[PDB]
Design an enzyme around this catalytic site. Structure first.
Site, PDB file in Angstrom:
ATOM      1  CG  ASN A 287      -3.736   3.296   6.759  1.00  0.00           C
ATOM      2  OD1 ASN A 287      -4.298   3.383   7.851  1.00  0.00           O
ATOM      3  ND2 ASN A 287      -2.952   2.270   6.438  1.00  0.00           N
TER       4      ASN A 287
ATOM      5  CG  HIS B  70      -6.930  -4.931  10.139  1.00  0.00           C
ATOM      6  ND1 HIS B  70      -6.145  -4.382  11.118  1.00  0.00           N
ATOM      7  CD2 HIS B  70      -6.548  -4.447   8.931  1.00  0.00           C
ATOM      8  CE1 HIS B  70      -5.296  -3.584  10.498  1.00  0.00           C
ATOM      9  NE2 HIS B  70      -5.499  -3.586   9.172  1.00  0.00           N
TER      10      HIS B  70
ATOM     11  CE  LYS C  19      -2.808  -0.232   3.630  1.00  0.00           C
ATOM     12  NZ  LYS C  19      -2.319  -1.564   4.090  1.00  0.00           N
TER      13      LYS C  19
END
Ligand SMILES: CC(=O)N[C@H]1[C@@H](OP(=O)(O)OP(=O)(O)OC[C@H]2O[C@@H](n3ccc(=O)[nH]c3=O)[C@H](O)[C@@H]2O)O[C@H](CO)[C@@H](O)[C@@H]1O[C@H](C)C(=O)N[C@@H](C)C(=O)O
EC number: 6.3.2.9
Length: 428
Positions: A138, A183, A115
């Site tokens: 983020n 997560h 990412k």
């Protein structure tokens, strides 16, 4: 959008929550802010006129709100927050607020790994073209802090958490790089729920860019990138676009196949956002990498100490280990808050006579159980480092690739990576 006279409640006194407080204040709106942490980090920096509530969510504030701005770190399924949603009270996050305000194209990037690398690469490609680009999300710089009328392109790294609360994103180009377990503490419906959050990134996106080698990145057609297949694929290694060689990866400072597919994803996005390919390829040759992302922090006496503290899930650590060449012994540090992940995919990398595991933090014992006969478990990363350091021989590698979040023991993964680097320099 206009917020004037609305009762605005922000959940989260971290980075996001503070950027939202400032957002609203600059717009003539005084929000109230709550956080379930008794002493959250942004408490110190909150303007004195802003009412705040810590140690729990305040339902009187929530049920009274016209608009709830939820930081990504609070689950929408929190019973207090589902109550408000059930009452029809609108709930957005900061990325949603940003999308309402932004007046330039947005390239949006999510994925379990890669990412920040792809986000930064697209930013560098924009800059190489002379485009005024704002890079954030983020990756660490709150998106609302990017808002600038001179800005010509926004590049956002987005988590599944941020995407859950976003409804107005219409990316000029959007990608999910890959989907791997992460997560799970926030997704009690498991991998598909996690994937479903990430798939929101494609909604209303002009160009969707998918990983041809990862089916879960695909919408339930997109431009693809892959290793052997894709519109953007690998061919000594060459980046190709539809069969035509565009770059020999010896020109890149980055290495490793997963980084060549990152480069492909970044070029796909940059092409879709309209950036000239020549300057985009140029940026690929200049970019040296990110801190805490397989970062050599000391090479001394024939030993490399590698800070891959950014490896906060199992897939990221796999990308470090998969194909890793080590001349002597790998001293692998694993540990922290595993977020209910299955660590067993790492087991196939840990065979042989040349591996040693040092496992710490909250899930140290489950990490050491990956291969008990080659594993040490300590409470802290510092104890693990002082344990391994006597054993290190020339040719060895010491790798911090912890497969876990650091929050149980550290402020963030950067702090974890910095402490490792100081200890490496001490002990190496
Ligand atoms: C958890 C999260 O999504 N973090 C992102 C967030 O940071 P911020 O400081 O604003 O976070 P936050 O929402 O206050 O949450 C931080 C922590 O506080 C806890 N928290 C938060 C609110 C609350 O009321 N209760 C509570 O206990 C959260 O569970 C989390 O454990 O906004 C920043 C700016 O966008 C991001 O850089 C940051 O990403 C980090 C680096 C990260 O770990 N992200 C995860 C999702 C990842 O990449 O996998």
């Amino acid at each position: 959008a206009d917020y004037q006279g609305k009762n605005v409640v922000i959940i989260g006194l971290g980075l996001t929550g503070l950027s939202c407080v400032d957002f609203f204040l600059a717009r003539g709106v005084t929000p109230r802010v709550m956080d379930t942490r008794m002493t959250p980090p942004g408490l110190d920096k909150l303007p004195e006129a802003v009412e705040r509530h810590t140690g729990s969510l305040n339902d009187e504030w929530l049920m009274a709100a016209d608009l709830i701005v939820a930081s990504p770190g609070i689950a929408l399924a929190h019973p207090s927050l589902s109550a408000a949603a059930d009452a029809g009270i609108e709930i957005v996050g900061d990325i949603e607020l940003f999308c309402r305000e932004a007046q330039a194209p947005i390239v949006a990037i999510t994925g379990s790994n890669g990412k920040s690398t792809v986000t930064t690469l697209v930013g560098e490609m924009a800059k190489a073209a002379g485009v005024n680009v704002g890079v954030g999300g983020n990756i660490g710089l709150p998106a609302l802090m990017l808002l600038d009328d001179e800005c010509e392109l926004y590049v956002l790294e987005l988590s599944s958490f941020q995407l859950e609360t976003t409804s107005s994103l219409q990316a000029v180009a959007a990608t999910i790089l890959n989907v791997t377990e992460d997560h799970m503490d926030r997704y009690p419906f498991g991998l598909q729920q996690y994937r479903a959050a990430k798939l929101r990134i494609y909604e209303n996106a002009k160009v969707c860019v998918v990983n041809a080698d990862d089916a879960l990145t695909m919408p339930i057609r997109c431009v693809s990138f892959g290793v052997n297949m894709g519109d953007y694929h690998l061919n000594e290694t060459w980046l190709r676009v539809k069969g035509e060689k565009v770059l020999n990866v010896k020109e890149m400072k980055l290495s490793g196949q997963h980084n060549y597919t990152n480069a492909l994803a970044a070029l796909a996005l940059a092409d879709a956002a309209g950036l000239p390919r020549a300057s985009s390829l140029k940026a690929l040759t200049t970019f040296t990498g990110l801190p805490h992302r397989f970062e050599v922090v000391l090479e001394h006496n024939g030993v490399r100490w590698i800070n891959d503290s950014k490896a906060t899930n199992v897939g990221s650590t796999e990308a470090a280990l998969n194909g890793l060449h080590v001349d002597g012994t790998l001293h692998l540090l694993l540990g922290g808050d595993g977020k209910s992940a299955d660590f067993s995919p790492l087991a196939r990398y840990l065979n042989g006579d040349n591996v040693r595991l040092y496992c710490f933090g909250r899930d140290g014992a489950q990490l050491a159980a990956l291969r008990p006969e080659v594993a040490e478990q300590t409470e802290t990363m510092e104890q693990a480092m002082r344990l391994l350091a006597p054993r290190v021989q020339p040719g060895d590698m010491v790798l911090l690739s912890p497969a876990c979040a650091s929050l149980d023991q550290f402020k963030n993964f950067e702090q974890r990576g910095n402490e490792f680097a100081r200890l490496a320099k001490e002990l190496g």
